[PDB]
Design an enzyme around this catalytic site. Structure first.
Site, PDB file in Angstrom:
ATOM      1  N   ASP A 474       0.839  -1.191   0.000  1.00  0.00           N
ATOM      2  CA  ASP A 474       0.000   0.000   0.000  1.00  0.00           C
ATOM      3  C   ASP A 474       0.877   1.245   0.000  1.00  0.00           C
ATOM      4  O   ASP A 474       2.010   1.223   0.483  1.00  0.00           O
ATOM      5  CB  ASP A 474      -0.929   0.005   1.213  1.00  0.00           C
ATOM      6  CG  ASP A 474      -1.917   1.150   1.186  1.00  0.00           C
ATOM      7  OD1 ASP A 474      -2.486   1.415   0.112  1.00  0.00           O
ATOM      8  OD2 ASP A 474      -2.135   1.782   2.240  1.00  0.00           O
ATOM      9  N   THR A 476       0.222   4.964   0.937  1.00  0.00           N
ATOM     10  CA  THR A 476       0.265   5.934   2.025  1.00  0.00           C
ATOM     11  C   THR A 476       0.003   5.243   3.353  1.00  0.00           C
ATOM     12  O   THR A 476      -0.995   4.532   3.507  1.00  0.00           O
ATOM     13  CB  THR A 476      -0.750   7.055   1.818  1.00  0.00           C
ATOM     14  OG1 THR A 476      -0.484   7.713   0.575  1.00  0.00           O
ATOM     15  CG2 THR A 476      -0.648   8.059   2.944  1.00  0.00           C
ATOM     16  N   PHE A 569     -16.706  10.125   6.546  1.00  0.00           N
ATOM     17  CA  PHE A 569     -15.936   9.798   5.356  1.00  0.00           C
ATOM     18  C   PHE A 569     -15.957   8.295   5.129  1.00  0.00           C
ATOM     19  O   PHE A 569     -16.061   7.513   6.076  1.00  0.00           O
ATOM     20  CB  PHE A 569     -14.498  10.290   5.510  1.00  0.00           C
ATOM     21  CG  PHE A 569     -13.555   9.753   4.477  1.00  0.00           C
ATOM     22  CD1 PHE A 569     -13.406  10.394   3.266  1.00  0.00           C
ATOM     23  CD2 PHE A 569     -12.803   8.622   4.723  1.00  0.00           C
ATOM     24  CE1 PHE A 569     -12.538   9.912   2.319  1.00  0.00           C
ATOM     25  CE2 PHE A 569     -11.935   8.137   3.776  1.00  0.00           C
ATOM     26  CZ  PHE A 569     -11.799   8.784   2.575  1.00  0.00           C
ATOM     27  N   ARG A 621       0.307  15.661  -3.227  1.00  0.00           N
ATOM     28  CA  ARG A 621      -1.012  15.080  -3.022  1.00  0.00           C
ATOM     29  C   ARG A 621      -2.019  16.218  -2.969  1.00  0.00           C
ATOM     30  O   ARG A 621      -1.754  17.246  -2.339  1.00  0.00           O
ATOM     31  CB  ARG A 621      -1.056  14.275  -1.725  1.00  0.00           C
ATOM     32  CG  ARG A 621      -2.324  13.488  -1.535  1.00  0.00           C
ATOM     33  CD  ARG A 621      -2.309  12.725  -0.225  1.00  0.00           C
ATOM     34  NE  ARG A 621      -3.504  11.904  -0.075  1.00  0.00           N
ATOM     35  CZ  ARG A 621      -3.778  11.173   0.996  1.00  0.00           C
ATOM     36  NH1 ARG A 621      -2.950  11.176   2.025  1.00  0.00           N
ATOM     37  NH2 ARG A 621      -4.885  10.448   1.046  1.00  0.00           N
ATOM     38  N   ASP A 679      -4.639   6.913  -4.457  1.00  0.00           N
ATOM     39  CA  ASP A 679      -4.535   8.224  -5.074  1.00  0.00           C
ATOM     40  C   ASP A 679      -4.656   8.123  -6.590  1.00  0.00           C
ATOM     41  O   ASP A 679      -4.653   7.038  -7.171  1.00  0.00           O
ATOM     42  CB  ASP A 679      -3.219   8.896  -4.702  1.00  0.00           C
ATOM     43  CG  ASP A 679      -3.167   9.306  -3.251  1.00  0.00           C
ATOM     44  OD1 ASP A 679      -4.089   8.942  -2.497  1.00  0.00           O
ATOM     45  OD2 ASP A 679      -2.208   9.999  -2.862  1.00  0.00           O
ATOM     46  N   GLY A 797      -3.866   0.421   6.955  1.00  0.00           N
ATOM     47  CA  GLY A 797      -5.059   0.664   7.743  1.00  0.00           C
ATOM     48  C   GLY A 797      -6.289  -0.138   7.371  1.00  0.00           C
ATOM     49  O   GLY A 797      -6.205  -1.136   6.651  1.00  0.00           O
ATOM     50  N   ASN A 799      -8.393   0.393   5.326  1.00  0.00           N
ATOM     51  CA  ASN A 799      -8.769   0.519   3.924  1.00  0.00           C
ATOM     52  C   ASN A 799      -8.828  -0.840   3.238  1.00  0.00           C
ATOM     53  O   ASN A 799      -9.632  -1.045   2.323  1.00  0.00           O
ATOM     54  CB  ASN A 799      -7.786   1.438   3.205  1.00  0.00           C
ATOM     55  CG  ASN A 799      -8.180   1.704   1.774  1.00  0.00           C
ATOM     56  OD1 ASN A 799      -7.744   1.009   0.860  1.00  0.00           O
ATOM     57  ND2 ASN A 799      -9.003   2.720   1.569  1.00  0.00           N
TER      58      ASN A 799
HETATM   59  N1  LIG Z   1     -10.918  12.667   5.260  1.00  0.00           N
HETATM   60  C1  LIG Z   1     -10.808  12.782   3.820  1.00  0.00           C
HETATM   61  N2  LIG Z   1     -11.460  13.856   3.429  1.00  0.00           N
HETATM   62  C2  LIG Z   1     -11.494  14.171   2.119  1.00  0.00           C
HETATM   63  N3  LIG Z   1     -10.869  13.394   1.211  1.00  0.00           N
HETATM   64  C3  LIG Z   1     -10.206  12.304   1.610  1.00  0.00           C
HETATM   65  C4  LIG Z   1     -10.167  11.993   2.903  1.00  0.00           C
HETATM   66  N4  LIG Z   1      -9.454  10.877   3.036  1.00  0.00           N
HETATM   67  C5  LIG Z   1      -9.052  10.504   1.821  1.00  0.00           C
HETATM   68  N5  LIG Z   1      -9.509  11.387   0.935  1.00  0.00           N
HETATM   69  C6  LIG Z   1      -9.332  11.384  -0.496  1.00  0.00           C
HETATM   70  O1  LIG Z   1      -9.991  10.037  -1.096  1.00  0.00           O
HETATM   71  C7  LIG Z   1      -9.073   9.438  -1.797  1.00  0.00           C
HETATM   72  C8  LIG Z   1      -9.190   7.908  -1.608  1.00  0.00           C
HETATM   73  O2  LIG Z   1      -9.196   7.630  -0.242  1.00  0.00           O
HETATM   74  P1  LIG Z   1      -8.532   6.202   0.213  1.00  0.00           P
HETATM   75  O3  LIG Z   1      -8.626   6.045   1.710  1.00  0.00           O
HETATM   76  O4  LIG Z   1      -9.253   5.077  -0.481  1.00  0.00           O
HETATM   77  O5  LIG Z   1      -6.955   6.239  -0.241  1.00  0.00           O
HETATM   78  P2  LIG Z   1      -5.788   6.833   0.748  1.00  0.00           P
HETATM   79  O6  LIG Z   1      -4.636   7.348  -0.075  1.00  0.00           O
HETATM   80  O7  LIG Z   1      -6.371   7.949   1.575  1.00  0.00           O
HETATM   81  C9  LIG Z   1      -5.214   5.465   1.861  1.00  0.00           C
HETATM   82  P3  LIG Z   1      -4.008   4.389   0.950  1.00  0.00           P
HETATM   83  O8  LIG Z   1      -2.881   5.233   0.426  1.00  0.00           O
HETATM   84  O9  LIG Z   1      -3.464   3.345   1.891  1.00  0.00           O
HETATM   85  O10 LIG Z   1      -4.701   3.728  -0.212  1.00  0.00           O
HETATM   86  C10 LIG Z   1      -7.753   9.928  -1.197  1.00  0.00           C
HETATM   87  O11 LIG Z   1      -6.795   9.912  -2.150  1.00  0.00           O
HETATM   88  C11 LIG Z   1      -8.076  11.380  -0.846  1.00  0.00           C
HETATM   89  O12 LIG Z   1      -7.911  12.159  -2.106  1.00  0.00           O
END
Ligand SMILES: Nc1ncnc2c1ncn2[C@@H]1O[C@H](COP(=O)(O)OP(=O)(O)CP(=O)(O)O)[C@@H](O)[C@H]1O
Length: 1085
Positions: A474, A476, A569, A621, A679, A797, A799
């Protein structure tokens, strides 16, 4: 048929016990003793011997296999009132069969037939005449009116106490005596004690005593280990602490034990080292839970009541209705009392109300603990290869024993004493420690791992970690540090003369500085603190807000802002929204991914498409911010109906200093590594290129145009090349696309290509996936398992918990600090995730390399031990054969000294250190392969050749002649000395020849222990052979030898060692490692 009714069982038959006379041995064995005594009133002794052996073996046979026990002791009956024991045939993947007792207790004038199997209750429903586990209301058909309707238990709840039981884990740890009694009847220990009984019969006293002491020591150590493990499991149990409970229309103080489903409770701040009692569901108030255990992340969720929801039509879904549920085993940081008055009186404590749903082992954490403790699968349960191997060895021993018998009968010896020698050989060939081999290796590997804070929940997955074909990561939280620096806001101005323009701070209008304040999930706890996501805290501090105790966060120099209501969220919904209020009016803020927010707001800016692409290209980002003014409880699709743009957020992601090297090591160690992120594909491809997953240019799949026409367009990262594709008609051109670019696939193009024919051809070459929802991660991992490649996923996490569970081996990297763990350990001295199969508390990413190295070492050590045990047993058997052919036999002291001089090498051999850098050669699994059989048979051939040569020599020096009625008395003779020393030297040489090579763990010269042991033992054997010191030979009763004989005796052993080394080296060089897969080839572009 199939009385018990539950998914655990398969079939059952009732049982009733039988008396001693009915038993299958006592009564049938009387006529045999009778005819024996009649015939008696020499050779007749072996008859009584074998009869007693058969009797004592039949007496123990039931305990080995439970079906045999049921068939011997019990008789099947169909009367459910008469039966007093019941047999359970388990389903394939749940535990193993057993015999359980049926108990009866009379209550309320009615008798109840109930038993407990695998700590999961049962009961006897008369109308259905079947055994059925108790089932809760939440699972079958929840009615959201009934939950709010419930008012608590009253009256006599004895039937409930019987049906659902006490609400706590029930794990008993038995005493040492009972556990050793259970171990004593095992077949392996009985076989070993029988083998020692033979040696006692053969007048070997000290040898048998030493062997027996060693056996007892090993068994005691194993029992201590198992007891320690059972004690370690109990730590998940929580000590009962007192809460209030609404019974009899008033509040009474009760303990955690006395809790049943649908019983009102009031929860407060979780006490230290405690958690929520059991699976609740909110009815009034609020809470801030920390799903540290189940999810695996410290970010605190927010839970709200179920009162506001409509009562009549709605059904409790556990989907959109998840904000109410409170799982058992997660600390609740804060609770707020109910706001408004209701029919039920307020709780004496300040806590919020709740309703219980499940208790005991049937909650989520409880069911996981039960599966971990009982239904887990042991390592190598089938155990067929070891039995085939032992049958092989027995065939060899029988081949030897036949010739032993022939020569013994020819040399005039009595058969009554020869049959015992044959049995000694046959029982000596068999290695006892062979089936229990790999378990000790896995336990040692676990003990070595736990020193690096990599805790294991399910141990039988370690051999999988040795040979992993593809391992995924993963982005982030795992490959990128948790701290995030804030760069600035971009694109807020409409003119946009410059594409890459940044407004640092206090240079943007009031709109955006209010927007960022409104759309946040931070909250200040009671005692005074701030808990939330690090990115959000970082941006909120950099902009200049400050959060107060209440919802209102103010004192930014611009006004007083408070949050009225907020929406949660989600992963599937890349957006979060909050409704705020200002001193003048009220508005609504939204904050989510840019691609999805573009489809919501009304005014699409002119440079919105270009700015976020130009900024995402290099590391950053990006998130979007939009707000709408709203005049004075409402739905969700109304606040996010249409919005107005306010600006971008641009964060920088810093790489973990550990992340650069581990991926290079894995790429060079014959593994293929891919990335699975969330992302947009630009940042994904950029990080993948900076770490070293993709070298050259990369291509991306995505929607062609705004219209959802399902047409995928290969488009370069820098928009230089554009290649169109269609899912219906066209097919991937291998040479044009896959050889040159190593494309990266977006989640949308994966959704469109569902059901396609070349989908599995595509999933071979892509190394980077972006914009995937949690279900698609599960789909990806299941497909990669389906193709036949073993997998490894290291996740940050909640996710991707579903993906973590599907992988052959999964790791969850909990965030931690080294200094914090050091301080915690110091405090513990001065005075636990269960989310994935494995857990790591340190935030470093080297845990992957660590666990792979440990699995590889465990596998290769198992192989080495197989070979060494087999060869030692064969050499011992054939040497004993060559001696027992004539009349001569060993003395007690000689055999005991040999035993000690071999145990010295056994002690040192297991000690070894693994190489730091991993090696390309991957070890193959399974007992039967060309390598093992070839090496064993050839080394054995060389050994038997040398032994035959020296035996011919010794017979040529002194000839033996058949004497009538030979008796195997010990006396010093050339044959005794020669064969004893050859046995010792070759049994020592096997260790030195078959010690494990360098590329996997280490060389022999590095560790001093085994080296000194081997050199000293060889020096002793040689000084005994070369007659350097007379006291040793004269004190151990070795015949003085001819000066011509010693030269041959020494040179044959030296050449034997060199030949064994040469052959083993050849076989290792040629047939050791299995070929790596096709997917893991570092093809150049
Ligand atoms: N609290 C939040 N509020 C608004 N947008 C959010 C957010 N958390 C995440 N996002 C946005 O939603 C997109 C997808 O979220 P997701 O949780 O699936 O990937 P992530 O990069 O945050 C965790 P990982 O990198 O492990 O996949 C993120 O890239 C971000 O742009």
């Amino acid at each position: 048929k199939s009385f018990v009714s539950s998914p655990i069982v398969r079939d059952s038959t009732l049982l009733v016990p039988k008396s001693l006379i009915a038993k299958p041995y006592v009564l049938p064995f009387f006529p045999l003793y009778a005819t024996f005594a009649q015939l008696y009133f020499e050779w007749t002794f072996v008859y009584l011997g074998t009869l007693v052996s058969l009797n004592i073996l039949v007496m123990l046979m039931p305990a080995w296999n439970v079906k045999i026990k049921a068939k011997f002791n019990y008789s099947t009956t169909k009367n459910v009132n008469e039966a007093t024991h019941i047999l359970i045939y388990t389903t394939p993947n749940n535990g193993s069969d057993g015999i359980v007792e049926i108990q009866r207790v009379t209550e309320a004038g009615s008798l109840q037939t109930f038993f407990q199997f695998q700590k999961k209750r049962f009961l006897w429903h008369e109308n259905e005449q079947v055994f059925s586990s108790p089932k809760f209301l939440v699972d079958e058909s929840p009615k959201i009116g009934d939950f709010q309707k419930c008012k608590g238990h009253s009256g006599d709840l004895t039937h409930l106490k019987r049906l659902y039981g006490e609400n706590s884990f029930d794990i008993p740890i038995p005493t040492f005596m009972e556990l050793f009694k259970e171990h004593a009847v095992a077949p392996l220990f009985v076989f070993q004690v029988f083998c020692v009984a033979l040696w006692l019969l053969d007048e070997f006293w000290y040898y048998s005593l030493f062997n027996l002491f060693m056996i007892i020591s090993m068994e005691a150590a194993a029992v201590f280990q198992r007891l320690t493990a059972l004690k370690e499991f109990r730590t998940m149990g929580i000590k009962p602490y007192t809460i209030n409970v609404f019974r009899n229309k008033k509040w009474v103080a009760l303990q955690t034990n006395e809790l049943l489903p649908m019983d009102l409770v009031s929860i407060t701040r979780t006490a230290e080292e405690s958690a929520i009692p059991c699976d609740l569901i909110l009815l009034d108030g609020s809470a801030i839970v920390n799903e540290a255990m189940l999810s695996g992340e410290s970010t605190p969720l927010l839970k709200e009541s179920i009162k506001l929801r409509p009562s009549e039509d709605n059904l409790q879904l556990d989907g959109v209705d998840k904000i109410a549920v409170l799982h058992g085993g997660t600390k609740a940081l804060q609770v707020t009392p109910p706001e408004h008055k209701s029919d039920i009186p307020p709780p004496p404590d300040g806590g919020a109300l709740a309703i219980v749903t499940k208790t005991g082992f049937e909650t989520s954490q409880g069911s996981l603990v039960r599966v971990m403790i009982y239904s887990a699968e042991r390592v190598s349960v089938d155990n067929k290869e070891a039995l085939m191997f032992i049958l092989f060895l027995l065939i060899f021993a029988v081949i030897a024993s036949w010739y032993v018998w022939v020569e013994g009968t020819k040399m005039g010896r009595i058969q009554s004493k020869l049959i015992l020698d044959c049995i000694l050989i046959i029982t000596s060939v068999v290695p006892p420690e062979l089936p229990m081999e790999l378990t000790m290796a896995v336990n040692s590997s676990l003990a070595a791992l736990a020193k690096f804070y990599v805790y294991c929940t399910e141990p039988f997955r370690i051999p999988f970690a040795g040979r992993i074909d593809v391992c995924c990561f993963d982005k982030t939280g795992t490959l990128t540090g948790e701290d995030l620096v804030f760069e600035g806001l971009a694109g807020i101005s409409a003119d946009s003369e410059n594409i890459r323009h940044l407004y640092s701070a206090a240079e943007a209008p009031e709109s955006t500085i209010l927007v960022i304040g409104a759309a946040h999930a931070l909250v200040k706890l009671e005692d005074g603190d701030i808990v939330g996501d690090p990115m959000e805290k970082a941006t909120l501090k950099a902009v200049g807000w400050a959060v107060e105790r209440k919802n209102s966060n103010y004192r930014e120099g611009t006004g007083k802002l408070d949050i009225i209501r907020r929406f949660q969220f989600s992963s599937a919904l890349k957006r979060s929204a909050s409704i705020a209020s200002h001193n003048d009016a009220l508005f609504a803020a939204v904050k989510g991914a840019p691609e999805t927010i573009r489809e919501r707001l009304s005014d699409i800016p002119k440079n919105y498409d270009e700015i976020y692409k130009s900024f995402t290209r290099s590391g950053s980002r990006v998130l979007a911010l939009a707000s709408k003014s709203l005049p004075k409880d409402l739905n969700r699709d109304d606040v996010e109906s249409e919005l107005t743009f306010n600006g971008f957020l641009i964060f920088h992601c810093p790489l973990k200093d550990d992340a650069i090297e581990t991926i290079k090591m894995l790429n060079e160690s014959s593994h293929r590594s891919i990335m699975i992120t969330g992302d947009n594909p630009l940042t994904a491809v950029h990080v993948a290129k900076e770490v070293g997953i993709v070298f050259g240019e990369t291509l991306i799949l995505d929607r062609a145009g705004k219209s959802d026409d399902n047409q995928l367009l290969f488009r370069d990262v820098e928009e230089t090349v554009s290649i169109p594709f269609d899912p219906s008609k066209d097919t991937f051109d291998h040479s044009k696309l896959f050889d040159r670019y190593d494309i990266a696939v977006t989640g949308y193009a994966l959704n469109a290509l569902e059901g396609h024919s070349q989908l599995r051809d595509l999933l071979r070459h892509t190394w980077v996936y972006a914009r995937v929802s949690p279900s698609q991660k599960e789909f990806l991992l299941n497909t990669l398992k389906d193709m036949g490649y073993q997998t490894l996923m290291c996740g940050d996490g909640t996710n991707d918990v579903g993906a973590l569970k599907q992988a052959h081996v999964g790791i969850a990297l909990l965030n931690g600090t080294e200094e914090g763990l050091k301080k915690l350990g110091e405090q513990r001295r001065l005075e636990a995730s269960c989310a994935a199969p494995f857990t790591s508390k340190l935030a470093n990413v080297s845990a992957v390399t660590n666990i792979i190295r440990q699995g590889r070492c465990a596998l290769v050590n198992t192989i080495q031990m197989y070979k060494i045990l087999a060869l030692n047993c064969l050499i011992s058997a054939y040497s004993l054969s060559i001696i027992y052919m004539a009349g001569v036999k060993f003395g007690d002291g000689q055999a005991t000294v040999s035993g000690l001089l071999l145990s010295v090498c056994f002690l040192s051999i297991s000690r070894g250190k693994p190489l730091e850098k991993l090696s390309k050669q991957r070890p193959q699994s399974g007992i039967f392969n060309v390598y093992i059989m070839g090496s064993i048979l050839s080394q054995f051939a060389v050994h038997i050749a040398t032994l035959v040569y020296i035996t011919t020599e010794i017979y040529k020096l002194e000839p033996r002649e058949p004497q009538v009625d030979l008796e195997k008395e010990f006396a010093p003779s050339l044959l005794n000395t020669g064969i004893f020393i050859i046995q010792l030297v070759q049994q020592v040489s096997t260790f030195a020849v078959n010690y494990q090579g360098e590329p996997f763990r280490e060389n022999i010269r590095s560790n001093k222990g085994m080296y000194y042991g081997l050199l000293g033992v060889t020096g002793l054997a040689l000084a005994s052979a070369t007659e350097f010191l007379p006291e040793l030979n004269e004190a151990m009763k070795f015949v003085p030898m001819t000066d011509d004989f010693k030269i041959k005796l020494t040179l044959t052993l030296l050449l034997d060692f060199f030949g064994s080394w040469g052959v083993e080296h050849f076989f290792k060089f040629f047939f050791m490692d299995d070929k790596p897969s096709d997917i893991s080839v570092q093809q150049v572009k």
